[PDB]
Design a protein around this ligand. Structure first.
Ligand SMILES: Nc1ncnc2c1ncn2[C@@H]1O[C@H](COP(=O)(O)OP(=O)(O)OP(=O)(O)O)[C@@H](O)[C@H]1O
Ligand SMILES: Nc1ncnc2c1ncn2[C@@H]1O[C@H](COP(=O)(O)OP(=O)(O)O)[C@@H](O)[C@H]1O
Ligand SMILES: [Mg+2]
Ligand SMILES: [Mg+2]
Lengths: 489, 463, 463
């Protein structure tokens, strides 16, 4: 009698159950037809639950039972190269998934004493991000901008650039139409990056509960690797749509709304999810595996995505995510329409980890880029009055324009650290000051192609080690000066 | 058994049944002694359901009798619906007898799964300069037109129908959701004057109808298009389908009009809390699968000229090509008033359209952005102090926005000038010549309402 | 004598007690079989109270038994809490065994009455020349430290801890109100690496904890600081105690969260009606009394860079000083990286700070302003106009800007832990001499990383 109940009301995906005196918070509930629910409201006389399937087949008078369980998803190195829904059920039609372990969807972050500082780098392949806004293993960096600015391109390029670094990736899609998901999956399979990637899909036609619960299951799938001495990288494509689904669910349950009709605990919703990404110490790994893994640390990096309305970053939702995360990458519509691609705005983009998450050579080299861009920024007003300006100011304008032209890049063309090092070193010493503002991209591409074509051992050494000494600098200068003449663009 | 009406408020009615005969969620009921049909929405307990009438509720009283049908609303499908006009319930309204088929399909169904999805891999030309250059279409994709009141959505839709649907080899479905009756009559007589009435089917629910009809009228046309998509012939392949929807915004507006009477709490600016879910449920059905393809064009209304409003903002993510119309361009006499700095398409990448097209589009957009940047300093200060390159940019940008105007075939009544059709090769030639600087001596008046660059040369010489 | 749960909605729990035994406001309750804690907030009649969970709530059901401890939340206090890390309930989370003490105090207390206020106003020396001259500190006052986007604020806090300790241990207390876990770990590790861990008690409230912890961690830290303040030595006088809260803004954010959860009508922007009440009641316990004093250094994060929002407007009536940091100066090589022009203080009254102090500070600020204005004219024209005028200001403000540099004791990467804790008199004398012109001829590049005038003189005679 304490584990039985009758349905009373059915509307909009919410079911009210009479009875179930032993139901817990978040407990799974089974229905007659094979559908599952989840208790969220424990009132004095009834229970309000959301349906994890489709509710159109449920009618009043049926029976429900409490299972004494919580939400769980399969985990392990078998979901790689697969597409599953929010509950781990495959949807690509490639047969059943044979997993050996399951883990809870709601979990707590590791303690403060079990953590470690972040000093390992993560490469995204973009010159602009890597040399000015570096990202380390265990960091939380936000990508924020307007519609049709290129957030998904940046995330997918970051995923693709992990071909040789050997870190697993997870892609979560919330509230998208299935054609875009299929296109993204096809592009991932084309480049060979599907062998170490998992996709969790919650499309626009799915119930709001699945769209609300998908990121936590993705986070558990990512945490599987962190708890055993490896590294992982998770990406949420839209937290705004998750917030919208949560708002719909909260409003349908008659909870008091606040600013912009959002509930009171949206900040809790995003914070208790984003706090689960960090780096753990070797003692934690030793204790978790009971001595199976001895001398390795684990990490989990997060790349959430937030979309603003007409560049209004003072709304209710984006401010919480901005405050929670460490750094932010801002993309602007005016820069995108003006040809600057990617559209990173260096004025208000920061990385609190800073140079501690960089290789030695890039750390030594990025200072010139930083100072040149700052000096160019210092004279924005008089760009249209070049006739009335100091000659030194004119030269600073020239060098800033050259750097701004250099910072451009194409799509699906990631750069290894050697390419960025060569280009930045060529820019720093003034070899690029004798060409016009145009043809800079052609010059860069030609130089990089030449260096990769005839200087294989040096490129391999820089890629695999990342050291910087007098011999390396001399060899790089010799190659650059050999390209400067006796060659064409 | 049968229930009885216990309360009516506007378009929302609730009925009380016995505890053992409560209908399902999306069932259809009939009121005895009347031509009124009700569709269940919610189950409130104690054998009480809440429904929405599909007609006027005048003359309805508490205590009438209602009988159930134990099925959703079913409409006819097949070739018998070609050349006929039907309402939301599938009844003929063209005074031409009954529909001559027997197959029926429910209007409520689930969307196709993830495994049965296809990739559009074909371009589609239109003859419109700006759309061809800056927002190419794809065969089997989705297109949307965004604009305020009185900016040219209907005219552009009609011109697209004239350019594409006439030279088509297939079928078509046209759905009218909350539009003018005069436009529907004009379109019907225009199609009947020619001999293309045998390839189209029409469903009409307009702005004079109760919210119940406007709520569910798009699903009927969607069901007809779905049946035509998944249709095969013995030793005969499938057929391509064109679908046209007018003001899909009225569907969400009708959903808004009844949200409060159903017992929900408002969100955002007075909107229903289930906006995105009920938009996506309908949007995921308009798609092309492995078995058959659908090409669709929709018109999206922007309330109060606010692109930030929740409805268009939610709609933006369901389309492949987006065309945005602006009142500022329209008020300057430039038609079609398409904003070139806010129109995008997924086909605009060098791997699909080639290098030259991509470079031309990027250069044009860059020039327009630079002119928009310079506008303020040009306005408040003078023009003499500008750099010479800035003057060249200003002149080139003004000529560029002049050259994007084009006289349409369906707009001959308004202006009296014959329409023009431009292949995209001439457009690319003209824009490349314009950006190169070959036409720096032509006055900017010669670029207004012409076809190719040859017409520009002729008009300039005649001047 | 025990109650049972009757309702669980979010983090709000309703417990039904007997009519006679109803726990008072702010009582602490413990569930029987679990390890969760609840705090009473209201009484609703018929033996029903509304509580809040002190942690996670998953794993609870209606019908569990709850017992009352007849007392508010009590935490350990004393010297035994030094060098440890504790949560909002005072339990150790550093894996080092239990805290060895038996003195317990409630975290809910009344502010000191009107007579207990200190009968004088005094200042507090820190060691940093720029913050000792341009932004004087107040003994027992509050410091509003804003500014900084990616700069090293935490190392500055640690160096402030070491500087005050070198002046006088003071038994500082750190309370991170909603701090990043990695930043907290870094702070603890770096304090451990500098042996300053023996004089600091730490309370941590993480970002992912329920908002009640985010509110109450500050109360726990304040209670510990008060107990340290009320400890008297052989002379009979109390200690001066330093308190650190990572962000006051997060405190008000959590207060708004909790108030919105409990179903209250929002305010003009959307905060709670009791913002000023809670902020004042918290802030009225941070005072200097007859025996001992309590100071407060707190980071400020302006909401949306607006000074008209209620969030900083409520706090501005309590901050006794303002300090800002500059990203460019941090990138310019000057380690302290404090912007002088933005950073000001209310303690610059010439009667209390000294007339010479006032004159020197104002003159130095005006000279720096003259340096600031000259850069635009230099960029436009150059120094052709500026001959025998405004150049002297250029060199003087060059050495003035270089003089704010100071090597830092805790930091060992760029210096070997130099003292550099010069008294105020040295700084005022040096600034007076530099303004007068005796050091005008001294090279400007000898002013980098110098503590006193004798040191820069030794440098100048060295080069
Ligand atoms: N570096 C680049 N160079 C050129 N084109 C690019 C670049 N990055 C992105 N694009 C193009 O910009 C367009 C928008 O990219 P994308 O789909 O990633 O944006 P988004 O912000 O995810 O969009 P949405 O508003 O649909 O969420 C696409 O056509 C893409 O090909
Ligand atoms: N190409 C054009 N040439 C001349 N007039 C046009 C053109 N396009 C639109 N218009 C004018 O704009 C008005 C709005 O057209 P229509 O699309 O029917 O209304 P709405 O934009 O509200 O749907 C029409 O009355 C028509 O006169
Ligand atoms: Mg996207
Ligand atoms: Mg219109």
């Amino acid at each position: 009698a304490k584990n039985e109940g009758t349905i009373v009301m059915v509307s909009d995906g919410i079911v009210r159950i009479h009875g179930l005196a032993d139901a817990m918070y978040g407990e799974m509930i089974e229905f007659d037809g094979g559908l599952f629910g989840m208790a969220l409201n424990l009132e004095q006389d009834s229970v309000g639950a959301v349906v994890l399937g489709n509710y159109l087949s449920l009618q009043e008078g049926q029976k429900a039972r409490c299972t004494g369980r919580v939400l769980e998803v399969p985990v392990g190195p078998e979901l790689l190269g697969r597409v599953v829904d929010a509950l781990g059920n495959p949807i690509d039609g490639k047969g059943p998934i044979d997993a050996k372990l399951t883990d809870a969807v709601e979990k707590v972050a590791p303690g403060v004493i079990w953590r470690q500082s972040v000093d390992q780098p993560v490469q995204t392949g973009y010159k602009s991000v890597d040399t000015m806004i570096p990202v380390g293993r265990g960091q939380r960096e936000l990508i924020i901008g307007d519609r049709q600015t290129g957030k998904t391109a940046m995330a997918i390029d970051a995923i693709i650039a992990q071909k040789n670094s050997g870190i697993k990736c997870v892609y979560v899609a919330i509230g998208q139409k299935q054609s875009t998901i299929a296109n993204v999956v096809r592009k991932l399979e084309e480049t060979g990056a599907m062998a170490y990637t998992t996709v969790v899909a919650a499309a626009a036609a799915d119930p709001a509960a699945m769209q609300y619960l998908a990121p936590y299951s993705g986070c558990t799938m990512g945490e599987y690797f962190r708890d055993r001495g490896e590294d992982a990288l998770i990406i949420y494509d839209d937290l705004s749509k998750q917030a919208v689904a949560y708002r719909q669910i909260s409003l349908l349950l008659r909870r008091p709304p606040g600013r912009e009709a959002y509930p009171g605990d949206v900040f809790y919703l995003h914070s208790r999810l984003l706090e689960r990404a960090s780096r753990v110490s070797a003692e934690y790994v030793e204790k978790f595996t009971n001595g199976a893994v001895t001398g390795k640390t684990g990490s989990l990096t997060a790349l959430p995505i937030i979309e603003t309305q007409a560049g209004d970053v003072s709304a209710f939702v984006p401010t919480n995510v901005i405050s929670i995360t460490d750094g932010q990458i801002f993309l602007e519509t005016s820069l995108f329409n003006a040809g600057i691609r990617p559209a990173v705005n260096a004025g208000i983009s920061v990385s609190r980890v800073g140079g501690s998450a960089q290789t030695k050579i890039i750390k030594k080299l990025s200072g010139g880029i930083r100072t040149a861009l700052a000096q160019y920024r210092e004279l924005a007003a008089f760009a249209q009055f070049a006739s009335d300006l100091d000659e030194a100011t004119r030269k600073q304008l020239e060098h800033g324009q050259r750097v701004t032209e250099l910072m451009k890049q194409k799509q699906y063309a990631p750069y290894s650290i050697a390419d960025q090092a060569v280009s930045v070193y060529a820019s720093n010493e003034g070899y690029m000051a004798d060409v016009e503002v145009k043809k800079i991209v052609d010059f860069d591409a030609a130089l990089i192609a030449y260096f990769r074509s005839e200087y294989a051992p040096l490129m391999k050494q820089i890629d695999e080690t990342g050291d910087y000494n007098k011999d390396i600098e001399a060899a790089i200068k010799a190659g650059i000066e050999s390209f400067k003449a006796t060659q064409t663009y | 058994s049968s229930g009885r009406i216990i309360q009516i408020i506007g378009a929302v009615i609730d009925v009380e049944f016995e505890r053992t005969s409560v209908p399902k969620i999306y069932d259809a009921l009939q009121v005895d002694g009347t031509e009124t049909t009700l569709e269940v929405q919610q189950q409130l307990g104690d054998g009480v359901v809440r429904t929405i009438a599909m007609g006027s509720t005048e003359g309805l009283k508490r205590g009438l009798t209602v009988t159930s049908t134990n099925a959703p609303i079913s409409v006819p499908v097949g070739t018998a619906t070609l050349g006929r006009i039907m309402d939301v319930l599938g009844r003929p309204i063209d005074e031409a007898g009954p529909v001559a088929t027997e197959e029926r399909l429910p209007i409520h169904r689930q969307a196709p799964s993830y495994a049965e999805q296809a990739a559009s891999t074909d371009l589609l030309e239109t003859g419109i300069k700006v759309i061809d250059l800056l927002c190419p279409f794809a065969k089997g994709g989705k297109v949307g037109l965004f604009g305020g009141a009185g900016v040219g959505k209907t005219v552009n839709m009609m011109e697209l129908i004239n350019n594409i649907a006439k030279a088509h080899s297939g079928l078509s479905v046209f759905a009218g959701v909350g539009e003018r009756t005069r436009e529907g009559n004009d379109f019907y007589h225009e199609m009947k004057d020619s001999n293309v009435l045998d390839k189209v089917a029409m469903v009409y629910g307009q702005m004079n109808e109760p919210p119940g009809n406007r709520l569910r009228v798009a699903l009927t046309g969607l069901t007809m298009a779905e049946y035509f998509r998944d249709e095969k012939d013995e030793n005969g392949k499938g057929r391509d389908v064109l679908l046209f929807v007018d003001n899909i915004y009225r569907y969400t507006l009708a959903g808004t009009e009844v949200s409060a009477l159903l017992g929900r709490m408002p969100s955002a600016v007075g909107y229903q809390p289930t906006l995105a879910e009920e938009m996506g449920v309908l949007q995921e059905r308009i798609t092309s699968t492995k078995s058959g393809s659908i090409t669709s064009i929709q018109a999206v209304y922007v309330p109060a000229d606010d692109l930030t409003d929740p409805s268009p903002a939610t709609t933006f993510a369901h389309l492949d090509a987006t065309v945005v119309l602006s009142r500022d361009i329209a008020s300057s006499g430039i038609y079609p008033a398409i904003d070139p700095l806010d129109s995008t398409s997924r086909q605009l990448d060098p791997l699909v359209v080639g290098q030259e097209h991509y470079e031309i589009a990027r250069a044009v957009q860059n020039v327009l952005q630079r002119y928009k940047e310079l506008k303020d300093i040009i306005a408040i200060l003078g023009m003499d102090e500008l750099a010479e390159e800035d003057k060249l940019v200003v002149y080139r940008a003004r000529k560029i926005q002049r050259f994007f105007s084009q006289p349409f075939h369906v707009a001959e009544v308004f202006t009296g000038a014959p329409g023009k059709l431009v292949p995209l090769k001439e457009t690319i030639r003209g824009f490349k010549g314009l950006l190169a600087g070959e036409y720096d001596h032509i006055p900017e008046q010669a670029f207004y309402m012409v076809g190719g660059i040859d017409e520009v040369i002729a008009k300039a010489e005649k001047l």
